[PDB]
Short mmCIF file of C-alpha atoms and ligand atoms in Angstrom, two decimals:
data_model
loop_
_atom_site.label_atom_id
_atom_site.label_comp_id
_atom_site.label_asym_id
_atom_site.label_seq_id
_atom_site.Cartn_x
_atom_site.Cartn_y
_atom_site.Cartn_z
CA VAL A 15 4.27 -2.65 -17.03
CA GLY A 16 5.15 0.97 -15.66
CA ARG A 17 4.31 4.38 -17.12
CA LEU A 18 0.79 6.12 -15.23
CA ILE A 19 0.23 6.23 -11.55
CA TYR A 20 -2.85 4.69 -10.96
CA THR A 21 -5.15 5.47 -7.72
CA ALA A 22 -8.05 2.57 -7.16
CA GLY A 23 -10.74 3.04 -4.54
CA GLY A 24 -10.25 5.05 -1.15
CA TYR A 25 -12.68 6.52 1.18
CA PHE A 26 -14.30 9.94 1.91
CA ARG A 27 -17.70 10.13 4.15
CA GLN A 28 -18.09 6.25 2.13
CA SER A 29 -16.03 3.70 0.48
CA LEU A 30 -15.21 5.26 -3.20
CA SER A 31 -14.88 2.71 -6.45
CA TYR A 32 -13.04 5.92 -8.67
CA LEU A 33 -9.89 4.53 -10.83
CA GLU A 34 -8.14 7.72 -11.91
CA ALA A 35 -4.68 7.23 -13.39
CA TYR A 36 -2.07 10.66 -13.25
CA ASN A 37 0.72 11.62 -15.79
CA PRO A 38 3.53 13.08 -13.95
CA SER A 39 5.06 13.58 -17.68
CA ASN A 40 2.40 16.50 -17.87
CA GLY A 41 0.10 16.76 -14.39
CA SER A 42 -2.75 15.17 -15.90
CA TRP A 43 -5.59 13.32 -14.38
CA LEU A 44 -7.47 10.68 -16.42
CA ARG A 45 -10.89 9.03 -14.64
CA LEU A 46 -11.07 5.10 -16.00
CA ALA A 47 -13.79 2.58 -15.55
CA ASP A 48 -15.10 2.33 -11.62
CA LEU A 49 -14.10 -0.53 -9.32
CA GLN A 50 -16.70 -3.56 -9.60
CA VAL A 51 -17.53 -2.91 -5.53
CA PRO A 52 -16.24 0.32 -3.89
CA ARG A 53 -13.23 -0.71 -1.53
CA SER A 54 -11.25 1.33 1.05
CA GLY A 55 -7.65 0.08 2.83
CA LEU A 56 -6.96 -2.13 -0.11
CA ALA A 57 -3.82 -2.83 -2.09
CA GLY A 58 -3.36 -2.06 -5.48
CA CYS A 59 -0.23 -3.67 -7.25
CA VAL A 60 0.83 -4.53 -10.99
CA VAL A 61 1.72 -7.67 -12.28
CA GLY A 62 2.46 -8.36 -15.99
CA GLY A 63 1.08 -5.43 -17.11
CA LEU A 64 -2.46 -6.04 -15.45
CA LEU A 65 -3.31 -3.83 -12.26
CA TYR A 66 -4.76 -5.83 -9.20
CA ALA A 67 -6.79 -4.48 -6.80
CA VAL A 68 -6.23 -6.47 -3.91
CA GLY A 69 -8.55 -6.95 -0.41
CA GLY A 70 -9.83 -3.32 1.54
CA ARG A 71 -13.52 -3.24 2.71
CA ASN A 72 -16.99 -1.51 1.70
CA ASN A 73 -17.71 0.73 4.11
CA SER A 74 -20.87 1.93 2.75
CA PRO A 75 -24.18 3.61 4.20
CA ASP A 76 -26.40 0.32 3.75
CA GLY A 77 -23.69 -1.54 5.87
CA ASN A 78 -19.92 -2.37 5.70
CA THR A 79 -17.96 -5.03 4.75
CA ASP A 80 -14.40 -6.40 4.31
CA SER A 81 -13.01 -8.05 1.06
CA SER A 82 -11.40 -11.21 0.16
CA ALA A 83 -11.55 -10.06 -3.71
CA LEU A 84 -8.84 -9.33 -5.65
CA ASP A 85 -10.11 -7.68 -9.28
CA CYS A 86 -8.02 -7.09 -12.17
CA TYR A 87 -7.52 -4.04 -14.20
CA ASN A 88 -6.63 -4.12 -18.16
CA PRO A 89 -5.08 -0.99 -19.38
CA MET A 90 -5.79 -1.84 -22.88
CA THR A 91 -9.64 -2.73 -22.54
CA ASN A 92 -10.06 -0.34 -19.82
CA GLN A 93 -12.48 -3.06 -17.90
CA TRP A 94 -12.32 -4.88 -14.35
CA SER A 95 -12.39 -8.45 -13.89
CA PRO A 96 -13.14 -10.43 -11.01
CA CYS A 97 -10.51 -13.37 -9.83
CA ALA A 98 -10.15 -15.91 -8.06
CA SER A 99 -10.76 -14.70 -3.77
CA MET A 100 -8.23 -14.91 -1.24
CA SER A 101 -9.19 -17.05 1.69
CA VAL A 102 -10.43 -14.54 3.98
CA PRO A 103 -11.30 -10.88 3.72
CA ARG A 104 -8.40 -8.52 4.88
CA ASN A 105 -9.44 -4.90 5.26
CA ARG A 106 -6.15 -2.56 5.86
CA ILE A 107 -4.31 -4.97 3.50
CA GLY A 108 -0.61 -5.20 2.59
CA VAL A 109 0.83 -6.39 -0.94
CA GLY A 110 3.78 -7.37 -2.13
CA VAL A 111 5.16 -9.39 -5.72
CA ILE A 112 8.04 -11.94 -5.63
CA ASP A 113 8.59 -13.16 -8.74
CA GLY A 114 5.24 -12.71 -10.71
CA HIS A 115 3.33 -13.89 -7.58
CA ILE A 116 1.08 -11.30 -5.56
CA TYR A 117 1.45 -11.94 -1.60
CA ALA A 118 -1.07 -10.79 0.71
CA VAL A 119 -0.11 -9.83 3.99
CA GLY A 120 -2.32 -8.99 7.12
CA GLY A 121 -5.29 -6.97 7.25
CA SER A 122 -8.19 -6.97 9.24
CA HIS A 123 -11.85 -9.18 9.41
CA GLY A 124 -14.02 -8.09 11.58
CA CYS A 125 -12.54 -7.70 15.02
CA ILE A 126 -10.26 -10.42 13.96
CA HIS A 127 -6.70 -8.87 13.12
CA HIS A 128 -5.14 -11.45 10.77
CA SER A 129 -1.12 -12.39 11.21
CA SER A 130 -1.85 -15.05 8.02
CA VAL A 131 -0.23 -14.22 4.41
CA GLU A 132 -1.33 -15.70 1.35
CA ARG A 133 0.28 -15.85 -2.10
CA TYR A 134 -1.55 -15.49 -5.53
CA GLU A 135 -0.65 -17.91 -8.65
CA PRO A 136 -1.71 -15.64 -11.72
CA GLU A 137 -0.87 -18.55 -13.93
CA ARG A 138 -3.14 -20.52 -12.58
CA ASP A 139 -5.91 -18.38 -10.33
CA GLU A 140 -4.95 -19.69 -7.12
CA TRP A 141 -4.11 -18.55 -3.54
CA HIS A 142 -2.37 -20.42 -1.23
CA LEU A 143 -1.71 -19.80 2.36
CA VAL A 144 2.15 -19.67 3.05
CA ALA A 145 3.71 -19.24 7.05
CA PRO A 146 2.14 -16.65 9.08
CA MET A 147 3.86 -13.40 9.97
CA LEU A 148 5.25 -13.39 13.75
CA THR A 149 2.76 -11.11 14.60
CA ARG A 150 -0.81 -9.90 13.98
CA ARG A 151 -0.52 -6.69 11.77
CA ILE A 152 -3.21 -4.18 10.02
CA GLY A 153 -2.82 -1.48 8.23
CA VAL A 154 0.44 -2.87 7.60
CA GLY A 155 3.50 -1.59 5.21
CA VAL A 156 4.10 -4.58 2.55
CA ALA A 157 7.19 -3.78 0.32
CA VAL A 158 9.72 -5.98 -1.70
CA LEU A 159 13.19 -5.75 -2.05
CA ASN A 160 15.94 -8.33 -3.22
CA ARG A 161 13.10 -11.06 -3.51
CA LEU A 162 12.15 -10.60 0.20
CA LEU A 163 8.84 -9.66 1.68
CA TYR A 164 9.15 -7.01 4.57
CA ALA A 165 6.03 -6.39 6.80
CA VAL A 166 6.43 -2.62 8.67
CA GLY A 167 4.26 -1.44 11.30
CA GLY A 168 0.83 -1.55 11.68
CA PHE A 169 -1.35 -2.48 14.43
CA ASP A 170 -1.83 -5.76 16.31
CA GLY A 171 -4.98 -5.71 18.03
CA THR A 172 -4.09 -3.72 21.16
CA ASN A 173 -0.63 -1.92 20.30
CA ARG A 174 0.10 0.54 17.43
CA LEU A 175 3.45 -0.72 15.99
CA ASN A 176 7.15 0.18 15.31
CA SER A 177 8.10 -2.97 14.66
CA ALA A 178 9.03 -4.91 11.07
CA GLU A 179 9.66 -8.28 10.04
CA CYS A 180 10.97 -10.25 6.83
CA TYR A 181 9.79 -13.05 4.63
CA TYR A 182 12.61 -15.92 3.23
CA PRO A 183 9.94 -17.27 0.53
CA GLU A 184 12.36 -20.13 -0.03
CA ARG A 185 12.66 -21.33 3.90
CA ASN A 186 8.96 -19.89 3.93
CA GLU A 187 9.89 -18.33 7.21
CA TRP A 188 9.86 -14.76 9.48
CA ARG A 189 12.20 -13.55 11.19
CA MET A 190 12.04 -9.64 12.70
CA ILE A 191 13.96 -6.98 11.36
CA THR A 192 15.65 -4.01 13.29
CA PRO A 193 12.31 -2.28 14.73
CA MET A 194 11.85 1.75 13.66
CA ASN A 195 12.51 4.52 15.30
CA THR A 196 8.73 5.51 15.49
CA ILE A 197 5.42 3.55 15.79
CA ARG A 198 3.31 3.95 12.52
CA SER A 199 0.16 2.26 11.97
CA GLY A 200 -1.31 3.38 8.79
CA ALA A 201 2.43 4.25 7.50
CA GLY A 202 2.87 4.51 3.55
CA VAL A 203 5.74 1.77 3.03
CA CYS A 204 7.71 1.44 -0.45
CA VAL A 205 11.09 0.63 -1.56
CA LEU A 206 13.59 2.78 -3.36
CA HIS A 207 17.36 1.79 -4.60
CA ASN A 208 18.28 -0.10 -1.43
CA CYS A 209 16.43 1.22 1.07
CA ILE A 210 12.83 0.49 2.43
CA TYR A 211 10.62 3.75 3.25
CA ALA A 212 7.97 4.16 5.82
CA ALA A 213 6.29 7.75 5.44
CA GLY A 214 3.76 9.26 7.79
CA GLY A 215 0.84 6.85 9.97
CA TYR A 216 0.07 7.26 13.25
CA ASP A 217 1.90 6.64 16.59
CA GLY A 218 -1.00 6.16 18.50
CA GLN A 219 -1.62 9.60 19.08
CA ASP A 220 -0.99 11.71 15.83
CA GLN A 221 -0.71 11.65 12.26
CA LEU A 222 2.94 11.40 11.39
CA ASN A 223 4.64 13.50 9.04
CA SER A 224 8.34 11.90 9.50
CA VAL A 225 9.74 9.63 7.05
CA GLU A 226 12.30 6.74 7.74
CA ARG A 227 14.05 4.44 5.48
CA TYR A 228 15.82 1.08 6.42
CA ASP A 229 18.77 0.38 4.70
CA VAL A 230 19.11 -3.53 4.32
CA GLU A 231 23.28 -3.54 4.34
CA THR A 232 23.78 -1.57 7.52
CA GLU A 233 20.51 -2.82 8.87
CA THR A 234 19.35 0.47 10.44
CA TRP A 235 16.18 2.91 10.16
CA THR A 236 17.15 6.56 9.48
CA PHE A 237 15.39 9.46 9.21
CA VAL A 238 14.93 11.85 6.41
CA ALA A 239 13.14 15.22 5.05
CA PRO A 240 9.68 15.17 6.33
CA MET A 241 6.81 15.18 4.18
CA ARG A 242 4.76 19.01 3.53
CA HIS A 243 1.61 17.21 5.29
CA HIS A 244 1.06 15.01 8.27
CA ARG A 245 -0.79 11.44 6.36
CA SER A 246 -1.76 8.27 8.18
CA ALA A 247 -4.12 6.00 5.06
CA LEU A 248 -2.03 7.26 2.82
CA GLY A 249 -0.91 5.91 -0.75
CA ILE A 250 2.65 5.65 -1.83
CA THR A 251 4.35 4.61 -4.94
CA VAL A 252 7.67 4.56 -6.78
CA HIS A 253 7.90 6.46 -10.43
CA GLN A 254 11.36 6.96 -11.97
CA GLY A 255 13.15 7.27 -8.80
CA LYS A 256 10.79 9.61 -6.89
CA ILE A 257 8.57 8.33 -3.92
CA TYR A 258 4.78 9.69 -4.39
CA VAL A 259 2.51 9.88 -1.62
CA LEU A 260 -1.05 10.00 -2.23
CA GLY A 261 -3.78 11.77 0.20
CA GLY A 262 -4.79 10.44 3.36
CA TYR A 263 -5.82 11.70 6.51
CA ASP A 264 -4.07 14.66 8.40
CA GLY A 265 -6.29 14.62 11.13
CA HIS A 266 -8.44 17.34 10.62
CA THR A 267 -8.93 16.68 6.56
CA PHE A 268 -9.13 13.80 3.94
CA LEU A 269 -6.25 15.10 1.88
CA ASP A 270 -6.14 15.99 -2.28
CA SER A 271 -2.45 16.63 -1.79
CA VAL A 272 0.30 14.37 -3.82
CA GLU A 273 3.67 14.72 -3.05
CA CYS A 274 7.21 13.55 -4.91
CA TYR A 275 10.38 12.85 -2.92
CA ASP A 276 13.99 13.49 -4.78
CA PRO A 277 15.90 11.53 -2.80
CA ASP A 278 19.02 12.74 -4.69
CA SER A 279 18.09 16.37 -3.47
CA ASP A 280 16.49 15.07 -0.11
CA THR A 281 13.34 16.66 -0.83
CA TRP A 282 9.48 16.61 -0.78
CA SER A 283 7.27 18.48 -3.28
CA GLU A 284 3.66 18.66 -3.79
CA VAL A 285 3.49 17.72 -7.41
CA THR A 286 -0.25 17.69 -7.87
CA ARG A 287 -3.74 17.29 -6.19
CA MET A 288 -6.18 14.21 -6.75
CA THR A 289 -9.80 15.45 -8.10
CA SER A 290 -11.24 14.45 -4.91
CA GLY A 291 -9.34 14.21 -1.57
CA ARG A 292 -9.35 10.64 0.14
CA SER A 293 -7.97 8.33 2.17
CA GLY A 294 -6.93 4.54 1.90
CA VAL A 295 -6.56 4.25 -1.56
CA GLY A 296 -4.76 1.31 -3.68
CA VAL A 297 -1.90 2.89 -5.78
CA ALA A 298 0.20 1.07 -8.72
CA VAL A 299 2.15 2.08 -11.79
CA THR A 300 1.72 0.73 -15.01
CA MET A 301 1.07 1.20 -18.93
CA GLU A 302 -1.21 3.80 -20.32
CA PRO A 303 -4.19 2.95 -21.36
CA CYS A 304 -4.18 3.12 -25.19
C1 51M B 418 -9.75 8.49 9.15
C2 51M B 418 -10.51 7.19 8.34
C3 51M B 418 -11.68 6.92 9.20
C4 51M B 418 -12.60 5.86 8.56
C5 51M B 418 -13.58 5.45 8.95
C6 51M B 418 -11.94 5.28 7.44
C7 51M B 418 -12.94 4.25 7.02
C8 51M B 418 -10.45 5.57 7.04
S1 51M B 418 -10.03 4.55 5.70
O1 51M B 418 -10.91 4.11 4.57
O2 51M B 418 -9.12 5.35 4.91
N1 51M B 418 -9.52 3.21 6.17
C9 51M B 418 -8.59 3.17 7.32
C10 51M B 418 -8.75 3.76 8.42
C11 51M B 418 -7.55 3.82 9.71
C12 51M B 418 -6.33 2.98 9.19
N2 51M B 418 -5.70 3.02 9.89
C13 51M B 418 -4.40 4.39 10.42
C14 51M B 418 -4.56 5.43 11.82
C15 51M B 418 -5.27 4.16 12.37
C16 51M B 418 -5.09 3.74 13.67
O3 51M B 418 -4.40 2.96 14.55
O4 51M B 418 -5.73 4.54 14.40
C17 51M B 418 -5.74 3.09 11.55
C18 51M B 418 -6.05 2.53 7.88
C19 51M B 418 -4.76 2.40 7.33
C20 51M B 418 -4.67 1.84 6.22
C21 51M B 418 -5.35 1.97 5.17
C22 51M B 418 -7.20 2.12 5.39
C23 51M B 418 -6.90 2.52 6.77
C24 51M B 418 -9.97 6.41 7.60
C25 51M B 418 -8.39 6.69 7.29
#
Protein backbone atom coordinates (compact mmCIF):
# COMPACT_ATOMS: atom_id res chain seq x y z
CA VAL A 1 0.00 0.00 0.00
CA GLY A 2 2.90 2.41 0.92
CA ARG A 3 6.63 1.46 1.45
CA LEU A 4 8.84 1.97 -1.79
CA ILE A 5 9.01 5.06 -4.12
CA TYR A 6 8.23 3.75 -7.66
CA THR A 7 9.38 5.70 -10.76
CA ALA A 8 7.42 4.64 -13.84
CA GLY A 9 8.39 5.66 -17.41
CA GLY A 10 9.79 9.09 -18.27
CA TYR A 11 11.76 10.70 -21.11
CA PHE A 12 15.42 11.21 -22.23
CA ARG A 13 16.04 11.41 -26.04
CA GLN A 14 12.95 9.12 -26.26
CA SER A 15 10.00 7.91 -24.09
CA LEU A 16 11.43 5.40 -21.53
CA SER A 17 9.69 2.26 -20.25
CA TYR A 18 11.86 1.89 -17.06
CA LEU A 19 10.19 0.93 -13.73
CA GLU A 20 12.68 1.48 -10.92
CA ALA A 21 11.86 1.50 -7.19
CA TYR A 22 13.89 3.51 -4.55
CA ASN A 23 14.40 2.41 -0.88
CA PRO A 24 14.86 5.65 1.18
CA SER A 25 15.64 3.25 4.12
CA ASN A 26 18.99 2.17 2.37
CA GLY A 27 19.26 4.54 -0.66
CA SER A 28 18.94 1.56 -3.10
CA TRP A 29 17.38 1.46 -6.59
CA LEU A 30 15.67 -1.75 -7.89
CA ARG A 31 14.97 -2.15 -11.66
CA LEU A 32 11.71 -4.07 -12.25
CA ALA A 33 9.35 -5.19 -15.04
CA ASP A 34 9.55 -2.69 -17.88
CA LEU A 35 6.34 -0.93 -18.99
CA GLN A 36 4.60 -2.69 -21.94
CA VAL A 37 4.72 0.51 -24.03
CA PRO A 38 7.14 3.37 -23.20
CA ARG A 39 5.30 6.47 -21.99
CA SER A 40 6.06 10.02 -20.89
CA GLY A 41 4.19 12.68 -19.00
CA LEU A 42 2.02 9.88 -17.56
CA ALA A 43 0.59 9.75 -14.05
CA GLY A 44 1.41 7.19 -11.39
CA CYS A 45 -0.94 6.28 -8.58
CA VAL A 46 -1.60 3.43 -6.15
CA VAL A 47 -5.03 1.86 -5.45
CA GLY A 48 -5.19 -1.10 -3.06
CA GLY A 49 -1.52 -2.09 -3.10
CA LEU A 50 -1.66 -2.08 -6.95
CA LEU A 51 0.30 0.58 -8.91
CA TYR A 52 -1.35 2.20 -11.95
CA ALA A 53 0.22 4.06 -14.88
CA VAL A 54 -2.34 6.46 -16.35
CA GLY A 55 -1.95 8.11 -19.77
CA GLY A 56 1.14 9.84 -21.16
CA ARG A 57 2.56 9.64 -24.72
CA ASN A 58 5.11 7.46 -26.54
CA ASN A 59 7.55 10.04 -28.07
CA SER A 60 9.38 7.37 -30.15
CA PRO A 61 11.77 7.56 -33.21
CA ASP A 62 9.25 5.42 -35.19
CA GLY A 63 6.47 7.97 -34.32
CA ASN A 64 4.86 9.88 -31.38
CA THR A 65 1.46 8.68 -29.96
CA ASP A 66 -0.55 10.07 -26.94
CA SER A 67 -2.08 7.41 -24.55
CA SER A 68 -5.57 6.49 -23.38
CA ALA A 69 -4.17 3.44 -21.55
CA LEU A 70 -4.28 2.60 -17.86
CA ASP A 71 -1.85 -0.20 -17.04
CA CYS A 72 -1.55 -2.00 -13.71
CA TYR A 73 1.62 -3.23 -11.99
CA ASN A 74 1.66 -5.74 -9.12
CA PRO A 75 4.63 -5.79 -6.70
CA MET A 76 3.88 -9.54 -5.80
CA THR A 77 3.92 -10.92 -9.37
CA ASN A 78 6.17 -8.19 -10.85
CA GLN A 79 3.95 -8.04 -13.99
CA TRP A 80 2.18 -5.24 -15.97
CA SER A 81 -1.48 -5.84 -16.88
CA PRO A 82 -3.42 -3.72 -19.43
CA CYS A 83 -6.69 -2.43 -17.85
CA ALA A 84 -9.76 -0.52 -19.29
CA SER A 85 -8.81 2.46 -21.52
CA MET A 86 -9.88 6.04 -20.85
CA SER A 87 -12.28 7.49 -23.42
CA VAL A 88 -9.55 9.82 -24.64
CA PRO A 89 -5.70 9.94 -24.92
CA ARG A 90 -4.24 12.28 -22.18
CA ASN A 91 -0.53 13.27 -22.42
CA ARG A 92 0.86 15.50 -19.58
CA ILE A 93 -1.99 14.06 -17.45
CA GLY A 94 -3.02 14.71 -13.83
CA VAL A 95 -4.28 11.95 -11.56
CA GLY A 96 -5.72 11.76 -8.03
CA VAL A 97 -7.57 9.15 -5.97
CA ILE A 98 -10.73 9.79 -3.90
CA ASP A 99 -12.47 6.85 -2.11
CA GLY A 100 -10.38 4.21 -3.96
CA HIS A 101 -11.34 5.64 -7.40
CA ILE A 102 -8.78 7.04 -9.83
CA TYR A 103 -9.64 10.44 -11.32
CA ALA A 104 -7.95 11.32 -14.66
CA VAL A 105 -7.60 15.07 -15.14
CA GLY A 106 -6.96 17.05 -18.33
CA GLY A 107 -3.91 16.07 -20.33
CA SER A 108 -3.35 16.82 -24.02
CA HIS A 109 -4.25 14.86 -27.22
CA GLY A 110 -2.61 16.11 -30.38
CA CYS A 111 -3.36 19.83 -30.65
CA ILE A 112 -6.40 19.45 -28.28
CA HIS A 113 -6.05 20.47 -24.65
CA HIS A 114 -8.58 18.63 -22.46
CA SER A 115 -10.88 20.35 -19.87
CA SER A 116 -12.40 16.84 -19.27
CA VAL A 117 -12.16 14.53 -16.19
CA GLU A 118 -12.74 10.76 -15.98
CA ARG A 119 -13.14 8.35 -13.05
CA TYR A 120 -11.95 4.75 -13.02
CA GLU A 121 -13.88 2.15 -10.99
CA PRO A 122 -11.41 -0.71 -10.37
CA GLU A 123 -14.15 -3.00 -9.07
CA ARG A 124 -15.91 -2.85 -12.43
CA ASP A 125 -12.93 -2.06 -14.69
CA GLU A 126 -14.90 0.96 -16.08
CA TRP A 127 -14.06 4.61 -16.88
CA HIS A 128 -16.81 7.28 -16.65
CA LEU A 129 -16.59 10.97 -17.51
CA VAL A 130 -17.63 13.38 -14.75
CA ALA A 131 -18.17 17.18 -15.03
CA PRO A 132 -15.18 18.91 -16.74
CA MET A 133 -12.73 21.43 -15.23
CA LEU A 134 -13.60 25.04 -15.70
CA THR A 135 -10.31 25.49 -17.63
CA ARG A 136 -8.43 23.34 -20.22
CA ARG A 137 -5.24 22.17 -18.55
CA ILE A 138 -2.16 20.23 -19.61
CA GLY A 139 0.95 19.63 -17.52
CA VAL A 140 -1.56 19.93 -14.69
CA GLY A 141 -0.85 19.22 -11.01
CA VAL A 142 -3.39 16.99 -9.21
CA ALA A 143 -3.77 16.39 -5.51
CA VAL A 144 -6.42 15.03 -3.23
CA LEU A 145 -6.93 16.53 0.24
CA ASN A 146 -10.02 15.85 2.43
CA ARG A 147 -11.62 13.70 -0.40
CA LEU A 148 -11.53 16.70 -2.84
CA LEU A 149 -9.62 16.75 -6.15
CA TYR A 150 -7.47 19.86 -6.93
CA ALA A 151 -6.19 20.83 -10.41
CA VAL A 152 -3.17 23.16 -10.04
CA GLY A 153 -1.64 25.27 -12.83
CA GLY A 154 -0.94 23.74 -16.23
CA PHE A 155 -1.28 25.20 -19.77
CA ASP A 156 -4.67 26.08 -21.39
CA GLY A 157 -3.56 26.09 -25.03
CA THR A 158 -2.66 29.82 -25.11
CA ASN A 159 -1.64 30.67 -21.51
CA ARG A 160 0.53 28.97 -18.88
CA LEU A 161 -1.54 28.88 -15.63
CA ASN A 162 -1.21 30.06 -12.03
CA SER A 163 -4.90 29.24 -11.57
CA ALA A 164 -6.25 26.27 -9.69
CA GLU A 165 -9.68 24.74 -9.08
CA CYS A 166 -11.27 22.24 -6.70
CA TYR A 167 -13.71 19.38 -7.53
CA TYR A 168 -16.53 18.43 -5.02
CA PRO A 169 -17.46 14.86 -5.99
CA GLU A 170 -20.94 14.77 -4.42
CA ARG A 171 -22.14 17.96 -6.24
CA ASN A 172 -20.00 16.81 -9.25
CA GLU A 173 -18.72 20.40 -9.83
CA TRP A 174 -15.55 22.46 -10.03
CA ARG A 175 -15.04 25.82 -8.27
CA MET A 176 -11.89 28.04 -8.59
CA ILE A 177 -9.70 28.27 -5.47
CA THR A 178 -7.18 31.04 -4.68
CA PRO A 179 -4.68 31.36 -7.61
CA MET A 180 -0.98 30.71 -7.01
CA ASN A 181 1.49 33.51 -6.55
CA THR A 182 3.50 32.09 -9.55
CA ILE A 183 2.45 30.81 -13.07
CA ARG A 184 3.28 27.05 -13.13
CA SER A 185 3.10 24.84 -16.23
CA GLY A 186 4.63 21.45 -15.56
CA ALA A 187 4.58 21.78 -11.75
CA GLY A 188 5.16 19.05 -9.14
CA VAL A 189 1.94 18.90 -7.08
CA CYS A 190 1.35 16.81 -3.92
CA VAL A 191 -0.37 17.00 -0.52
CA LEU A 192 1.56 17.02 2.76
CA HIS A 193 -0.45 17.33 6.06
CA ASN A 194 -3.12 19.96 5.27
CA CYS A 195 -1.22 21.90 2.64
CA ILE A 196 -1.08 21.51 -1.22
CA TYR A 197 2.47 21.94 -2.56
CA ALA A 198 3.12 23.15 -6.12
CA ALA A 199 6.90 22.90 -6.67
CA GLY A 200 8.86 24.14 -9.73
CA GLY A 201 7.37 24.12 -13.23
CA TYR A 202 7.66 26.63 -16.09
CA ASP A 203 6.33 30.23 -15.92
CA GLY A 204 6.44 30.72 -19.72
CA GLN A 205 10.11 31.93 -19.56
CA ASP A 206 12.24 29.75 -17.17
CA GLN A 207 12.26 26.51 -15.05
CA LEU A 208 11.20 27.26 -11.50
CA ASN A 209 12.78 26.19 -8.15
CA SER A 210 10.09 27.97 -6.03
CA VAL A 211 7.81 25.76 -3.91
CA GLU A 212 4.55 27.28 -2.74
CA ARG A 213 1.86 25.62 -0.65
CA TYR A 214 -1.88 26.16 -0.43
CA ASP A 215 -3.29 26.05 3.10
CA VAL A 216 -7.02 25.01 2.76
CA GLU A 217 -8.09 26.59 6.09
CA THR A 218 -6.44 30.00 5.40
CA GLU A 219 -7.10 29.69 1.54
CA THR A 220 -3.64 31.23 0.85
CA TRP A 221 -0.65 30.18 -1.20
CA THR A 222 2.74 30.75 0.51
CA PHE A 223 6.31 30.28 -0.61
CA VAL A 224 8.63 27.89 1.28
CA ALA A 225 12.35 26.92 1.07
CA PRO A 226 13.12 26.66 -2.73
CA MET A 227 14.44 23.44 -4.30
CA ARG A 228 18.24 22.97 -4.90
CA HIS A 229 17.58 22.82 -8.68
CA HIS A 230 15.20 24.48 -11.09
CA ARG A 231 12.74 21.82 -12.52
CA SER A 232 9.74 21.52 -14.91
CA ALA A 233 8.30 18.09 -15.91
CA LEU A 234 9.31 16.60 -12.50
CA GLY A 235 8.18 13.63 -10.37
CA ILE A 236 6.64 14.28 -6.94
CA THR A 237 5.46 11.97 -4.12
CA VAL A 238 5.12 11.99 -0.29
CA HIS A 239 6.76 9.37 1.85
CA GLN A 240 6.92 9.33 5.66
CA GLY A 241 5.99 13.03 5.97
CA LYS A 242 8.62 14.18 3.41
CA ILE A 243 8.00 15.47 -0.22
CA TYR A 244 10.39 13.78 -2.73
CA VAL A 245 11.02 15.48 -6.18
CA LEU A 246 12.31 13.24 -9.02
CA GLY A 247 14.32 14.47 -12.00
CA GLY A 248 12.78 16.74 -14.59
CA TYR A 249 14.21 19.35 -16.94
CA ASP A 250 16.34 22.30 -15.69
CA GLY A 251 16.61 24.25 -18.94
CA HIS A 252 19.99 22.69 -19.82
CA THR A 253 19.62 18.97 -18.73
CA PHE A 254 17.21 16.10 -17.81
CA LEU A 255 18.19 15.66 -14.11
CA ASP A 256 18.93 12.42 -12.24
CA SER A 257 18.58 14.69 -9.11
CA VAL A 258 16.18 13.37 -6.34
CA GLU A 259 15.49 15.94 -3.47
CA CYS A 260 13.61 15.45 -0.09
CA TYR A 261 11.68 18.18 1.73
CA ASP A 262 11.58 18.14 5.55
CA PRO A 263 8.62 20.51 6.24
CA ASP A 264 9.56 20.46 9.98
CA SER A 265 13.09 21.71 9.22
CA ASP A 266 11.95 23.78 6.07
CA THR A 267 14.76 22.19 3.94
CA TRP A 268 15.38 20.49 0.61
CA SER A 269 18.14 17.91 0.51
CA GLU A 270 19.83 15.85 -2.24
CA VAL A 271 18.77 12.28 -1.34
CA THR A 272 19.92 10.12 -4.26
CA ARG A 273 19.96 10.17 -8.04
CA MET A 274 18.00 7.92 -10.41
CA THR A 275 20.09 5.42 -12.51
CA SER A 276 19.28 7.46 -15.68
CA GLY A 277 18.49 11.22 -15.68
CA ARG A 278 14.97 11.91 -17.18
CA SER A 279 11.76 14.06 -17.21
CA GLY A 280 7.99 13.49 -17.23
CA VAL A 281 8.08 10.51 -14.85
CA GLY A 282 5.06 8.79 -13.22
CA VAL A 283 5.66 8.36 -9.49
CA ALA A 284 3.81 6.34 -6.87
CA VAL A 285 4.47 4.76 -3.40
CA THR A 286 3.44 1.17 -2.51
CA MET A 287 4.68 -2.11 -0.93
CA GLU A 288 7.99 -3.77 -1.83
CA PRO A 289 8.12 -6.49 -4.46
CA CYS A 290 8.47 -9.63 -2.35
C1 LIG B 1 11.83 19.32 -22.11
C2 LIG B 1 11.04 18.20 -22.69
C3 LIG B 1 11.06 18.05 -24.07
C4 LIG B 1 10.34 17.04 -24.67
C5 LIG B 1 10.41 16.93 -26.15
C6 LIG B 1 9.60 16.15 -23.90
C7 LIG B 1 8.85 15.09 -24.62
C8 LIG B 1 9.54 16.26 -22.49
S1 LIG B 1 8.65 15.20 -21.59
O1 LIG B 1 8.61 13.93 -22.19
O2 LIG B 1 9.03 15.20 -20.23
N1 LIG B 1 7.12 15.82 -21.58
C9 LIG B 1 6.73 17.10 -21.12
C10 LIG B 1 7.10 18.21 -21.82
C11 LIG B 1 6.72 19.49 -21.37
C12 LIG B 1 5.97 19.64 -20.23
N2 LIG B 1 5.57 20.92 -19.74
C13 LIG B 1 6.51 21.56 -18.78
C14 LIG B 1 6.72 22.98 -19.27
C15 LIG B 1 6.33 22.94 -20.75
C16 LIG B 1 5.86 24.29 -21.21
O3 LIG B 1 4.79 24.82 -21.03
O4 LIG B 1 6.81 24.94 -21.91
C17 LIG B 1 5.22 21.89 -20.81
C18 LIG B 1 5.57 18.49 -19.48
C19 LIG B 1 4.80 18.61 -18.30
C20 LIG B 1 4.43 17.50 -17.60
C21 LIG B 1 4.81 16.22 -18.05
C22 LIG B 1 5.56 16.08 -19.19
C23 LIG B 1 5.95 17.22 -19.93
C24 LIG B 1 10.29 17.32 -21.91
C25 LIG B 1 10.33 17.56 -20.43
